Design a binder for this molecule. Sequence first.
Ligand SMILES: *[C@@H]1O[C@H](CO)[C@@H](O)[C@H](O)[C@H]1NC(C)=O
Lengths: 164, 54
Amino acid sequence: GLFGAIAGFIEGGWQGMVDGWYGYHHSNEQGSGYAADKESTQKAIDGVTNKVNSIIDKMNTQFEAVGREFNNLERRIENLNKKMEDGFLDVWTYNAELLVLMENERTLDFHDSNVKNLYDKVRLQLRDNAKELGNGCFEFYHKCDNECMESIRNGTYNYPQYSE
Amino acid sequence: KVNGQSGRMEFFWTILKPNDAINFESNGNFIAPEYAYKIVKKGDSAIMKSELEY
Ligand SMILES: *[C@@H]1O[C@H](CO)[C@@H](O)[C@H](O)[C@H]1NC(C)=O
């Protein structure tokens, strides 16, 4: 995407994650396991919900074309009415389509931003105790069990662990 | 001749306010009113040019 995470430096998405748009997949002696980073998913869910609410409520006074009947010698005023209603409906269709397109753009890029930001959050803690394998994974230079991974998830990784 | 009848009837309409009066006078060609319509309930409505049934 615009930030390079989705279909970028991370190859593709995990079918095995069902409870979050983003997450971790840890593998140590205590097994492997997926986990959802709930907080970032909630940021994204709020984003999308507020976007849908905005789309619904920002065009809640659009235009209502009520019908007016005219005789045969009021062709001018009838045509005025006709092309007026036509023009209003055209401009409001334009507005709806632009909103839909621009929001699709911003939303896809928002998700990309969230993935890149999560990768950066992990990297900024793991600074030197680990090494980037280039595709979204981090190799731990020390031994660290499931509570290590939990401290990484909730954001409290303790840097003093000897790593050689 | 329209419907085999050449003569033409032209109808007019008005709306009397409460407590007011209307006065007709004539000496010919008077298609006089026999009924009228009280406007008992305004509202929000429309006229729909459609062909469907109910
Ligand atoms: C109609 O009758 C009322 C009596 O209830 C009278 O006051 C009023 O003046 C009459 N209308 C006109 C136009 O005079």
